Paper text:
Comparison of the PanAsia virus capsid with a high-resolution X-ray structure determined here of native PanAsia confirmed that the integrin had not significantly altered the virus structure, except for the GH loop of VP1, which contains the RGD. In most O serotype viruses, including PanAsia, a disulphide bond bridges residues 134 of VP1 and 130 of VP2, causing the loop to become disordered. Reduction of the disulfide bond stabilizes the loop against the virus surface abrogating integrin binding.
FMDV, a small non-enveloped RNA virus (genus Aphthovirus, family Picornaviridae), exists as seven antigenically distinct serotypes and many variants and sub-types. Structures of several serotypes determined at near atomic resolution have revealed a capsid composed of 60 copies each of four structural proteins (VP1 to VP4). A prominent feature of this otherwise rather smooth capsid is an exposed flexible loop (∼30 residues) on VP1, termed the GH loop. This loop and the RGD motif embedded within it (residues 145–147 in the O serotype) comprise a major site of neutralization by the host humoral immune response and mediate FMDV binding integrin89101112.
Author numbering:
A (entry chain 2): 13 to 218
B (entry chain 4), G (entry chain 4): 15 to 39, 65 to 85
C (entry chain 1), F (entry chain 1): 1 to 132, 157 to 208
D (entry chain 3), E (entry chain 3): 1 to 219
Write the structure that this text describes.
């Protein structure tokens, strides 16, 4: 089950793929609306993978232990500079989450992309599957892949004041090592902004 | 369309009764539910 | 039915797997537009009341179901019991406008006033959650004012819902949540 | 002269759920375009079918763990949308706003143990009128399915709608001591080095699951 | 018998803006002819488009004067129909009776100096989210236009509608410290013997300027 | 877009000049007939009230917009709260006629009287300004009288406007005129 | 024509509901606005 994903001049290959989950839609909604008066443009150079460590999954983590990553996050590449050069932006996300141990580990992680996530309560975690998601079950796979479009009450956003998407990873069944499994599993994310459009060029700092 | 059951046309124009939608240029979950796998993944005996 | 559980592709087994027969189902009562299209009571403030669907109590049928949508759209109807004349003002209006009668004003007529109002927000759609707890002030359907408002009911018309969110039942302390059911 | 009419007693009061619309007051407003926004749902049951959610077991967890002891019962609960085991599901959240239902409820079981852990499970439906089975042998005579672990980690089983009446109540009456709709019984036939491994279970609406008669009862 | 009818509660009160007409009482009156009287207007925005009116600058004047000093800022104000600079325009007079708008606002600049006075100007639009530019060099990175004086004394520039939402508010909230819609920045690149000469500026509605949601807020 | 500014020929630049795109606009709310077609309150006199649109307060939506027309035409509607019977008399009538019931008289009926009245002036059109401050006495829509009039509202029907005049917003002391906007 | 939204014909004749106009023998501002110059007065480079 080999899958190779390409975003710009960056590729990621997995031999333990369970496929890709498309959330809420297969294609983006109209990118040119009346709120940008035809002044918007696409920035292909930003549509590439950037990386970040999420957390270390250990045996002491119990059901419900979760990690949240609001998007967009700090970006030190071209995508990041866009947020300092333009007032309005929009983009979707191509998300790949990895948790590598071996096939002798047990336990299970749920990774989901949740819109407008202003903290979630304990009982609500039982229904996290309502959101675009995929599981990471060591006996089967080490990679989760989710792809979602831009969402929001506005056609374009101001990322300095609003984060439409939150990546969440939750432990559903605790990690087991059983003598031959990996002692712990570090969870990493490989993310790429998709269809990035910007509008309203800012002045410089000079 | 929702919980409405009158057989006569509304006395007022649509332009007054409701806001009017505009276009640019159960949808998703209905398609998702309809696409559900509903069989057996293996071989069936008797 | 066995399958790859890590996938997330929906799987719907049927009773046919063991010789049963799937029946016919009628789901009109779980249709979004239909179920939200009914009045729900809200506790009002004496005079100025900003029309905001989030005022609906979270445990009510309308309140709970509305909150299972992150984004929604709807026109509105209100039924109000009030003294004096009732004045409505659209989204974005200065509070001071609530005292001017040229803005839609309904003269008192017992026992209450029922009004159909259009969606009036600057956004293409509104939300029940916003990651910016607290919602932007532009998320409203205008405001009303009267000498005294005693009852306020909201009714969502032509409702549309996007991106489902958790819907929680009561958590029982016992094996089952038992309630006294209507009986002769 | 003019048209004579009879203003009828017993008609005209405001009914919170009436099928008519109010008179308008502010016309001609055009909305911002919103065609083809992602993630739309038009019927609550479509998401109940497509998105299974977690059951809750002793200890506030969505799984049951394999055990090594003569007792092979993994879980046994009342087939009721008001059951504690179903209390955190989307299905139960929706059901509380309707008084009746009929149709299939699907249960999903996902094995989470390591590759060198194997097990064989059994799910059975015990109808009302007799105490539920305590052993797999006794439960064999009920409608049931057995399956083992392997490449595919998930198994789905349809709990059938079986009753005297065409609809059953979603709520459970306080004068109702023994469950009216029966029990779902999850057993462990045996296992091979699967001690402590978790089997997570979810529930979703089946093709003919139906909810009717909306009701606002608090909750 | 006669037609039975239900006099419905919640309907029938006088609404100051209702879509129906009153019953008549005095018929058959014919008016003096008035066809083709000059100067008719049928939509307030047609005159807002066709008749630009003056902006107001420090000192109660419709112009800004060229200066000779390192500071090249001629004018900088909040892009708001509630701005002091726009307070005497027809556009602002109309906007106060609506809560929302979208579309283009045109600015007109007319040089008034003598034939032997020359200058080069720059107009820029700085979007919200960052402090407005203090120099022409910094403002160069914004949407902008530069022009010089000559035979044609006037230059017109369209301030674009750029926002997250499809509509913006005409009024400015008291809890709104930093302008929500940005700033218009008028700079002087340089000049040739134009000290003390006036550049008058006007504003008019653009082709897609739109006002919606009438409101009577006093004013 | 450069042009001869002394000319007065309207010039309308567009965002296309720098690569933008002009959008669609819907201007129904700024249509003259539509915007003036709503009730506006006026403070009445106890008994005799001459119907005169210039009584509308200049700062109100209807009052301000009417004053931006130098000449106008319109039929009229009035809503009146009054004790006793209400009598209307046409333009040019002797004041004494206000007491004779054969002239359009509405018998009291709670809570108020709404009436549609025709334009009745001898002029082809009326004006909001007349250089002859003070307007000719023939500029009116007749007069009404009742034992006591408590409320009087005017509504212009089929309005026509000619020759626009200044329309002023409030002059701010600060950089912007700030107002408390309706918010939840 | 203005702020009216009934789909049914008025019960009363037009001759009673309103005054009647007579003939002898947004017009001007609409034409003025439509005639506006909307281009560039000079030569355009790229």
């Amino acid at each position: 089950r080999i899958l190779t994903t390409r975003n710009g001049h960056t590729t990621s290959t997995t031999q333990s793929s369970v496929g890709v989950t498309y959330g809420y839609a297969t294609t983006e909604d109209f990118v040119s609306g009346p709120n940008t008066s035809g002044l918007e443009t696409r920035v292909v150079q930003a549509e590439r993978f950037f990386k970040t460590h999420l957390f270390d999954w250990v045996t002491s983590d119990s059901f419900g232990r979760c990690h949240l990553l609001e998007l967009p996050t700090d970006h030190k590449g071209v995508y990041g500079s866009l947020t300092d050069s333009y007032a309005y932006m929009r983009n979707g996300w191509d998300v790949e989450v990895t948790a590598v141990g071996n096939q002798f580990n047990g336990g299970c992680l749920l990774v989901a992309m949740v819109p407008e996530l202003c903290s979630i309560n304990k009982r609500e975690l039982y229904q996290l599957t309502l959101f675009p998601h995929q599981f990471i079950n060591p006996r089967t796979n080490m990679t989760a892949h989710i792809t979602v479009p831009f969402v929001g009450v506005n056609r374009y956003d101001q990322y300095k004041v609003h984060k439409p998407w939150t990546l969440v990873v939750m432990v559903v069944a605790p990690l087991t090592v059983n003598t031959e499994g990996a002692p712990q599993i570090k969870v990493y994310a490989n993310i790429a902004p998709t269809n990035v459009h910007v509008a309203g060029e800012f002045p410089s700092k000079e | 369309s929702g919980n409405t059951g009158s057989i006569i046309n509304n006395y007022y124009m649509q332009q007054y009764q409701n806001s009017m939608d505009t276009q640019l240029g159960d949808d998703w979950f209905s398609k998702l539910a309809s696409s559900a796998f509903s069989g057996l993944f293996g071989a069936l005996l008797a | 039915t066995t399958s790859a559980g890590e996938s997330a592709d929906p799987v719907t087994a049927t009773v046919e797997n063991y010789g049963g027969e799937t029946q016919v189902q009628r789901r009109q009562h779980t249709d979004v537009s239909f179920i939200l299209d009914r009045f729900v009571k809200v506790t009002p403030k004496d005079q100025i009341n900003v029309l905001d669907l989030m005022q609906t109590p979270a445990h009510t049928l309308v309140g709970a179901l509305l909150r299972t949508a992150t984004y929604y759209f709807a026109d509105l109807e209100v039924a109000v019991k009030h003294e004096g004349n009732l004045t409505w003002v659209p989204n974005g209006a200065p509070e001071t406008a609530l005292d001017n009668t040229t803005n839609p004003t309904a003269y008192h007529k017992a026992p209450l006033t029922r009004l159909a109002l259009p969606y009036t927000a600057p956004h293409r759609v509104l939300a029940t959650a916003y990651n910016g707890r607290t919602l932007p002030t532009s998320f409203n359907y205008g405001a009303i004012k009267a000498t005294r408002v005693t009852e306020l009911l909201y009714r969502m018309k032509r409702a549309e819902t996007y991106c489902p969110r958790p819907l929680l039942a009561i958590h029982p302390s016992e094996a089952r949540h038992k309630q006294k059911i209507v009986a002769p | 002269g003019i048209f004579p009419v009879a203003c009828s007693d017993g008609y005209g009061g405001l009914v919170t759920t009436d099928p008519k619309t109010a008179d308008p007051a502010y016309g001609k407003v055009f909305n911002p375009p919103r065609n083809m926004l992602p993630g739309r749902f038009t019927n609550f049951l479509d998401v109940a079918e497509a998105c299974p959610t977690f059951l809750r077991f002793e200890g506030d967890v969505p799984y049951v763990t394999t055990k090594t002891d003569s007792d092979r019962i993994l879980a046994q609960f009342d087939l009721s949308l008001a059951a504690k085991h179903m209390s955190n599901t989307f299905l139960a959240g929706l059901a509380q706003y309707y008084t009746q239902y009929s149709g299939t409820i699907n249960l999903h079981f996902m094995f989470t143990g390591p590759t060198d852990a194997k097990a064989r499970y059994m799910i059975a439906y015990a109808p009302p009128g007799m105490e539920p089975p305590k052993t797999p042998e006794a439960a064999a005579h009920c409608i049931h399915a057995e399956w083992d672990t392997g490449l595919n980690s998930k198994f789905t089983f349809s709990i059938p709608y079986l009753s005297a009446a065409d609809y059953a109540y979603t709520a459970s009456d306080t004068a109702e001591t023994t469950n009216v709709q029966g029990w779902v019984c999850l057993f462990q036939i045996t296992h091979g080095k699967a001690d402590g491994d978790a089997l997570v279970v979810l529930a979703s609406a089946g093709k003919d699951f139906e909810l009717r008669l909306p009701v606002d009862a608090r909750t």
